Amino acid sequence: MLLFCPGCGNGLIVEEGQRCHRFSCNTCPYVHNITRKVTNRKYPKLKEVDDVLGGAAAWENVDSTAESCPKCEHPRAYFMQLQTRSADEPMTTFYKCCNAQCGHRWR
Amino acid sequence: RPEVIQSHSIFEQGPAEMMKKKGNWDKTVDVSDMGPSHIINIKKEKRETDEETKQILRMLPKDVSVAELLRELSLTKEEELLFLQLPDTLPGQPPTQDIAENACTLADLTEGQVGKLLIRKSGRVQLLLGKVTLDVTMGTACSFLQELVSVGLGDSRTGEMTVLGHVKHKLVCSPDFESLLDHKHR
Amino acid sequence: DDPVVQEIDVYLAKSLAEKLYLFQYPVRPASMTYDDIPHLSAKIKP
Ligand SMILES: [Zn+2]
Ligand SMILES: [Zn+2]
């Protein structure tokens, strides 16, 4: 912890004297004998998370279900739509289909 | 250093850690009740927040002007030196000061009563300084040392310096622009 | 909101209008006053 000299207000340093450890100024004679226990606790942040993920419900909390893919036609699906390329005047979609765990991903 | 360190399933007792931690630093060499070893209680080192100076020991809300004047009047009879700021011009004419409509300050007025101070219901504090009432607000609260001194140059080369007391609080005065403007809107 | 308390009179004095200064110490807290330490020299340019 920062502690400052009552005289000149520079920063104190800890050093050792002939009877005690002392807080001492570097620029004036002031010293302060450590007579008793003095402490400073940091209390850092612990690693709070454990973070298991990738569950199927964490995958299918998106709108689409019971639609039709051009590959395997299954109802349990995971869709996506893009538009952010205006060279593509048509729309952009991508689909995931996992009822039979077939796993297609096409345009 | 042997790297293959071994570990066990047993659960650490809470007090066993508490008493080990206790025994690690509760030892004290304070037995030296001697001059050098002694320490001056009025010259402790300054912990940085000045309201919170005490790091070593023998063992906040923000007040307002109505609470400021109540504690100095009702709670205590003892007088207190304040430090109040004024607006840039006080609402007067410089009395035969050889002018231009320039600034009118306290250096141009005379001794005698200059006004009255009205503490209203619900914390409103005004300074009626003639026909206009100013507004009094607590300023930034200082927590360092301030001393009010009188420097008198009784002779060309020598004189007297005298400390009158410590100044704690700082007040701020400001014109009520809404009431000044609501007389004649523009 | 009538002025329920403390219609306090405000006066003005000029006898110390050109002698009064204000010394403030930016590095010294309000507890540790200089009331006890003896002083040796006080110098000023008016
Ligand atoms: Zn120092
Ligand atoms: Zn598919």
Q: Are A83 and A91 in contact, with CB atoms under 8 Å apart? A: yes
**Tokens found for residue B139:** 């300023």
**Tokens found for residue C20:** 């009064």
User: What is the experimental resolution, given in Å to one decimal place?
Assistant: 3.1
Q: Are A24 and A33 in contact, with CB atoms under 8 Å apart? A: no
CA atoms within 13 A on the CB side of A77: 20
Report the run of H or E that residue B38 belongs to, with start and end.
Answer: none
Distances from the Cα of B38 to the Cα of A6, A15, A84, B96, C6, angstroms:
17, 17, 76, 65, 50
Measure in Å the smallest separation between the Cα of C43 and chain A Cα atoms: 20
Q: Report how this structure was experimentally obtained.
A: cryo-EM
**Tokens found for residue B172:** 């701020």
Q: Are A97 and A69 in contact, with CB atoms under 8 Å apart? A: yes
Residue among C18, C12, A59, A77 at smallest CA distance from B151: C18
CA–CA separation, B150 and B47 (whole Å): 32
CA–CA separation, C39 and C42 (whole Å): 8
CA–CA separation, A74 and B5 (whole Å): 55
Chains that touch A (3 or more CB pairs under 8 A): B, C
**Tokens found for residue A84:** 């952010």
Q: What distance in angstroms lies between residue A21's CA and the mean position of ligand 1's atoms?
A: 17
Chain C residues within 8 A of A6 when measuring between CB atoms = 28, 32
Interface test with A, best of C25, C27, C31, C36 (most A CBs within 10 A): C27
Report the run of H or E that residue A44 belongs to, with start and end.
Answer: none
